[PDB]
Enzyme design. Structure first.
Site, short mmCIF file in Angstrom:
data_model
loop_
_atom_site.label_atom_id
_atom_site.label_comp_id
_atom_site.label_asym_id
_atom_site.label_seq_id
_atom_site.Cartn_x
_atom_site.Cartn_y
_atom_site.Cartn_z
N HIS A 41 0.81 -1.22 0.00
CA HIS A 41 0.00 0.00 0.00
C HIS A 41 0.85 1.28 0.00
CE1 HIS A 41 0.10 1.29 4.26
NE2 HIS A 41 -0.13 0.04 4.65
N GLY A 134 2.45 6.16 10.55
CA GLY A 134 3.88 6.01 10.28
C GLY A 134 4.43 4.67 10.76
N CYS A 136 3.30 1.64 9.86
CA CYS A 136 3.17 0.64 8.79
C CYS A 136 4.52 0.07 8.36
CB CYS A 136 2.39 1.20 7.60
SG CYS A 136 0.64 1.53 7.94
#
Ligand code: RN0
Ligand code: RN0
Ligand code: CL
EC number: 3.4.19.12
Lengths: 296, 305
Positions: A41, A134, A136
């Site tokens: 993503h 942040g 991820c």
């Protein structure tokens, strides 16, 4: 003495964390050998990926910019081929864990590790983590001997505050997809084999008020446990608790009768290992390891 | 979202852990630059522990009596000195993995990460707090002596604790990295007992503000309190007195959530009176006191839910 929620030493994983930027999105990547793994993503994913070139992906390892020389997708993970092999690459494996199993999470922001905590893969495949925007690409792992087994990569937060992610091959844990849509965690259950392991750890540390003279059958215990949203206890779970049963002298179905009485009557103002709730994020192996001193 | 007991990444500390052996005793040492720091009780026998004269035991030792092992490499000891309850072993090799560091002495209520080690090998990391009675509720077995407590704010490791002993109740006692014990403890096997422990009030308040930030307000009430009335009530539940310093320190969290410190003190008062009534706060059925106001601001979002 003492019983803490203990994570594995994170150093071998810290030396692999990098920052991955693609356009406006910045998240964390895992740099192993000459490949950086991160959530796809960050970029119809094949249609979006085909429009990207190697130089669109900015990879930063500390103060050094890594050069992306190739890219490919494997399920929900993006694999960025870089021109430099990580000199700090530890001995590692990619492993897929089962619900009830525990692991350490190294939470990162901008490729910089900020904290380490221990958690469990819930029966509904979510993790009750602690992550902000942040985070991820933060990874879950275990260490067995000198080998790091990577088992989780963070992808998203659900509306209830719980977290969802994939193994390192990009397959999600749970019926989740990596997109902004109506997704909700299923009804969660308590990890019974882990609560039993934690009750054995309390006995080892000198907490026996909950022990009683009674024993039960596996069937009767499961009929009662199903009423309190507890996961069914299998003969495999009973076998796995064997060593702790032999060490303390309390048979697994003897401890099940203690758990049955705790479920039907509560703690009555008392605590077990400083907790007023029955703790389910320590596996039988975690209990044996913390009450033995296994090093890495 | 979410709120976990979070420890600092331990890598910078792992690269400093060594094994120190003196005779039959083996424990952990902290190798920083060309010095290995470890508990001075490594020079003792179990008999010696009743009334050890460390100065007399140390004078009989030479550099080659101390064996220091860093991974699979033996370090050569070229000097030794005692500073309070810490033994400082000068070695012939500076640690190439020495991070930027400081030795800091913490106060009760402060939190830190512990890297538990055995035989100079790190086995686990956990977060804990210096209790008001100066003990720590750790998880340590025999061989863990010399394990260290630290904070890593930015790129600098602040070493604040070195493990020395387990008290009869299962709690742990130790020193700062200059060898001064926290609490009225001695590195002696004597009738020593931890004082009655109390709850760290400023930390419970910080944790109540973290619950409000994560969207939970069921415990708030329409009441306020004076600081004196709050302390008269809190003392009855074995809670530490809340000082004006604590009220000042909670200022930022009060401004972020919109709840005055003395109004949060009123919810705390009510929680102590009523209990939780089957409810939880941040997944806990007890009032949590091992998160400081600083830990809450570091872990939680800047935007209240
Ligand atoms: C929602 S926010 O407050 O603006 O930012 C957050 C906050 C905490 C967060 C904690 N873990 C993860 C976050 N990110 C997302 O879930 C992003 C996302 C969205 C759709 C699909 C996918 Cl696969 C991923 C988080 C975002
Ligand atoms: C020897 S035992 O009590 O069976 O094993 C333990 C268990 C947990 C333990 C946890 N931390 C430390 C231990 N060792 C000691 O306290 C050694 C000691 C003795 C007297 C005075 C001092 Cl300064 C030190 C521990 C021992
Ligand atoms: Cl302090």
């Amino acid at each position: 003495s003492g019983f803490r929620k203990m994570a594995f030493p994170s150093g071998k994983v810290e030396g692999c964390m990098v920052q991955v930027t693609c356009g406006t999105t910045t998240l964390n990547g895992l740099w192993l050998d000459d490949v950086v793994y991160c959530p796809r993503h960050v970029i119809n994913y094949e249609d979006l990926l085909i429009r990207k070139s190697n130089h669109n992906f900015l990879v930063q390892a500390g103060n050094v910019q890594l050069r992306v020389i190739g890219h490919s997708m494997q399920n929900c993970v993006l694999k960025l081929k870089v021109d430099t092999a990580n000199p700090k690459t530890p001995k590692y494996k990619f492993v897929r864990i089962q619900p009830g199993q525990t692991f350490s999470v190294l939470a990162c922001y901008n490729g910089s590790p900020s904290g380490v905590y221990q958690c469990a893969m819930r029966p509904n495949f979510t993790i009750k983590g602690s992550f902000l925007n942040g985070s991820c690409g933060s990874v879950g792992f275990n260490i067995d001997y000198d080998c790091v087994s990577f088992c989780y990569m963070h992808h998203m937060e659900l509306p209830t505050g719980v977290h969802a992610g994939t193994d390192l091959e990009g397959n999600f844990y749970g019926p989740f997809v990596d997109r902004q849509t109506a997704q909700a965690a299923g009804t969660d259950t308590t990890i019974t084999v882990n609560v039993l392991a934690w009750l054995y750890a309390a006995v080892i540390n000198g907490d026996r008020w909950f022990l009683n003279r009674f024993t039960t059958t596996l069937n009767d215990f499961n009929l009662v446990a199903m009423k309190y949203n507890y996961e069914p206890l299998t003969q495999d779970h009973v076998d796995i608790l064997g060593p702790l049963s032999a060490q303390t002298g309390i048979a697994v179905l003897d401890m099940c009768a203690s758990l049955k009485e705790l479920l039907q009557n509560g703690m009555n103002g008392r605590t077990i290992l400083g907790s007023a709730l029955l703790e389910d994020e320590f596996t039988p192996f975690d209990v044996v390891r913390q009450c033995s001193g296994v090093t890495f």
